[PDB]
Structure formats: structure tokens, C-alpha cells
């Protein structure tokens, strides 16, 4: 994998449809707890525990406390240099007739916060709910999301479970349903939305340059988007603090934090 910024810039200057795949490293560079590293524990657990169908079926109140806390911290976190570079590039290139699109693995909406408009959130969003009864999805930014979660979600180890009864957790406001809401967040072991994936496949087919930023390239099928693209002639360039299992299959690899290497790459 090449590490020449000059070569990538030559592809970039000539690229017309740029696909950027961003992972949890970009949010971590904003101080956003990922609960996947190195990236924070929530009282005893990480996202491999609470972000599962298992955790929600066993203790939906604990799963809601977890996500309520993450919603609440997003009011203190800001987009970093990588977000701004990615957003600014999209606007500058959009005026030149060139399209930049961000396929993100994260749910904290920091890309949208920076001004990115072409955003595909393959794993959902902290600020969208889904009804476990009728399936309707809704944006939701209310703090707290429901009254019984007010002041809840404290992340400190040894903090007592809210144990909120299911009827007082966020409920579907669609008339006639009142079903139990869950975060519109793809959990481990759930199938991604086929419509979003069809939109992703459409972007991967028409793009002529691909960037993979802040991704450990171990979460599927998100780690499969890039190799499917490189195998069409399209250059793939990785921006990550470390080498991932998919490094040897990329045209470029730029070691470093995304906030250091992306502003130079997207300039």
C-alpha cells in the first residue's frame, strides 16, 4: 500500500464521485466514547454487551439508559478537524459538479453536525427511534427522551439500574400503537436495512475514488464495501491510526489520526 500523498492527490483532483467510509475512529477523535476500544465502558459493559438483541430483550431499561447517556453526551461533543474537512470538501466539490458522499458506521450524527449532507448512516442514529410493534421510525432529539429517564444513564460503575417499567420507557406516539420504542440502531447480529444497503451499492458502483477513514475494518458488511470497490479499478485509500486486516488490499495507507491526514487529503 502506497503512502504518497502526491499520488492520491492526483486521483483526487480528477475524481468526480468520491465515497468516504468513516468509522468509530473519527468520533473517538472528538472524545466521543465508542464503547468498543479502548473507547470507554458503560458502568460494567461495552457496546458488544448492551448493543445487542440479547441485552434489549433481557433488560430494555438498561439498554435505554445506555443510549440515553450517549444521547446526552452528544451535547458536549463537537466535530473534529476530520469532520470539518469532510464537510467542507463536500460543499466545495458540490459547486464544481463533483459529488462527495459519506457512508458512516457511527450513530452519533457528528458528520451531520459538521454540515455533511450526503450522509448514509448504515447503522442508524442515536437520535432516531423505531417502534418494536409497528416499525415506524422517527427523529427524536428530546432531552431526556422520556420523563422516567431524566437524570438516569449515569455511567459510573456501581450505579444502580433505573429498572424503569416497560410502560414508562419511550413509547410509540403513533395513534393506536403505543408500542415500545427502541433506538433505531443496528445492533450486533441484526441485518442492515436492505434499502440503505441498496443505496450504498449504488454509490459504490458509480464512484471513482474511495476513502476508508477511522475504520478498524473488522465490522461487517461495512468492512466489505472497500474491497468490492477497489476490485473495479477504483483507488481505495485508508486513513487510520493503525493498519487493519484490510490494509494489504488498499491502494494507499496513510498512518495517523484522521484529523491530521484528511485535511491534507481533501484540500
Amino acid at each position: 500500500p502506497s503512502s504518497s500523498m502526491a499520488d492520491f492527490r492526483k486521483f483526487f483532483a480528477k475524481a468526480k464521485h468520491i465515497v468516504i467510509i468513516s468509522g468509530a475512529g473519527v468520533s473517538a477523535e472528538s472524545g466521543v466514547p465508542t464503547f468498543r476500544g479502548a473507547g470507554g465502558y458503560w458502568r460494567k459493559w461495552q457496546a458488544q454487551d448492551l448493543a445487542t438483541p440479547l441485552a434489549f430483550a433481557h433488560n430494555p431499561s438498561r439498554v435505554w439508559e445506555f443510549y440515553h447517556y450517549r444521547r446526552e453526551v452528544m451535547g458536549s461533543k463537537e466535530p473534529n478537524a476530520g469532520h470539518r474537512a469532510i464537510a467542507e470538501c463536500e460543499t466545495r466539490l458540490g459547486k464544481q459538479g463533483r459529488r462527495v458522499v459519506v457512508i458512516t458506521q457511527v450513530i452519533d450524527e457528528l458528520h451531520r453536525k459538521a454540515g455533511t449532507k450526503n450522509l448514509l448512516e448504515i447503522h442508524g442514529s442515536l437520535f432516531k427511534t423505531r417502534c418494536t410493534s409497528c416499525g415506524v421510525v422517527a427523529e427524536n432529539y428530546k432531552s431526556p427522551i422520556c420523563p422516567a429517564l431524566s437524570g438516569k444513564g449515569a455511567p459510573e460503575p456501581g450505579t444502580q439500574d433505573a429498572s424503569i417499567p416497560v410502560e414508562k420507557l419511550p413509547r410509540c406516539e403513533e395513534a393506536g400503537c403505543g408500542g415500545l420504542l427502541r433506538p433505531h440502531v443496528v445492533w450486533f447480529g441484526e441485518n442492515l436495512d436492505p434499502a440503505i444497503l441498496e443505496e450504498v451499492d449504488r454509490e459504490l458502483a458509480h464512484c471513482d475514488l474511495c476513502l476508508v477513514v477511522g475504520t478498524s475494518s473488522v465490522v461487517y458488511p461495512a468492512a466489505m464495501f472497500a474491497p468490492q470497490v477497489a476490485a473495479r479499478g477504483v483507488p481505495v485509500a485508508e486513513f487510520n491510526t493503525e493498519t487493519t486486516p484490510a490494509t494489504n488490499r488498499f491502494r494507499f495507507h496513510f498512518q495517523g489520526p484522521c484529523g491530521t491526514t484528511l485535511p491534507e487529503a481533501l484540500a
Partner: peptide, 4 residues
């Protein structure tokens, strides 16, 4: 394709 399920989320690993």
C-alpha cells in the same frame, strides 16, 4: 448481511 448481518452486522458483525
Amino acid at each position: 448481511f448481518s452486522k458483525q
